[PDB]
Amino acid sequence: DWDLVQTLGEVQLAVNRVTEEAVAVKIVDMNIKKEICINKMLNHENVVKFYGHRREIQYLFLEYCSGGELFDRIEPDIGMPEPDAQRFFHQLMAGVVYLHGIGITHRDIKPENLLLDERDNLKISDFGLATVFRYNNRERLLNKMCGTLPYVAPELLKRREFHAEPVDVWSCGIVLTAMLAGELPWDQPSDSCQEYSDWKEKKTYLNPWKKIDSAPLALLHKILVENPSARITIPDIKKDRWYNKPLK
Numbered sequence: 001d002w003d004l005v006q007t008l009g010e011v012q013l014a015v016n017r018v019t020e021e022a023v024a025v026k027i028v029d030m031n032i033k034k035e036i037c038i039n040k041m042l043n044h045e046n047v048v049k050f051y052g053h054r055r056e057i058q059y060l061f062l063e064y065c066s067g068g069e070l071f072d073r074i075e076p077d078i079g080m081p082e083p084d085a086q087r088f089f090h091q092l093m094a095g096v097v098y099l100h101g102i103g104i105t106h107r108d109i110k111p112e113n114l115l116l117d118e119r120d121n122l123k124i125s126d127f128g129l130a131t132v133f134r135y136n137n138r139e140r141l142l143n144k145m146c147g148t149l150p151y152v153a154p155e156l157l158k159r160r161e162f163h164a165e166p167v168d169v170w171s172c173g174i175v176l177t178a179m180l181a182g183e184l185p186w187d188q189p190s191d192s193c194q195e196y197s198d199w200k201e202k203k204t205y206l207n208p209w210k211k212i213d214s215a216p217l218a219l220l221h222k223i224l225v226e227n228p229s230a231r232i233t234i235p236d237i238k239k240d241r242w243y244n245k246p247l248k
């Protein structure tokens with residue numbers, strides 16, 4: 001038996017009447033079948049845990065993350081301490097490597113979908129837009145536009161089909177930019193976007209790039225690459241100098 005204590009954002013905080021264990025419950029009014037199936041596949045310390053579901057309407061039982069969303073740890077126009085950003089980025093990569101390893105792409109990575117537990121461990125949240133991109137070791141290209149414009153990779157806007165993995169890598173790059181600068185670089189990654197044009201012309205003397213140290217900036221130079229085929233992959237991110245730099 002669970003008491004619904006408060007609304008978290010609909011999602012409510014449920015507390016067990018006997019054990020007082022707290023979980024989050026997602027309530028949807030009547031595709032949900034897919035989200036549940038994907039959630040049932042998921043088991044990793046940087047992915048929100050799925051506990052089960054009950055039907056009537058539909059209820060999803062999810063790991064409660066008391067630290068809230070990463071979004072709220074980001075100070076507008078400033079960001080956060082670089083060591084905090086690195087630690088969160090490490091954990092983000094951990095989660096994303098896990099997902100890609102089981103053939104799942106999140107497709108909407110952004111700070112609103114990155115939660116923190118009581119120890120400030122990052123948890124990737126919400127698989128409502130996620131999909132399978134590898135099955136029986138065979139990759140399938142994506143073609144549906146999904147995600148959130150400031151975070152989407154340029155190939156989603158220009159190409160009919162594209163690989164799932166570089167898209168998630170890109171959005172993680174924008175998250176990192178936000179964590180380090182406290183702002184998003186562009187409304188969308190298109191040529192009609194002056195700030196995107198400037199980035200492509202390497203005007204890093206402009207904001208948000210001017211606020212970012214050269215070492216993390218060098219990593220961003222390899223992530224925010226327009227050609228998804230030339231974009232740095234995760235295995236190579238893990239070899240990056242800043243990624244491996246000891247920090248406070």
Ligand SMILES: NC[C@H]1CN(c2ncnc3[nH]cc(-c4cccc(CO)c4)c23)CCO1
Pocket residue numbers: 008009011024026048062063064065066068069112113114115125126
């Ligand atoms: N805007 C606040 C946000 C909070 N979010 C959660 N907060 C605390 N623990 C949680 N566990 C699971 C969720 C959650 C469930 C479904 C979607 C999302 C959004 O990324 C989070 C959660 C609940 C939603 O609102």
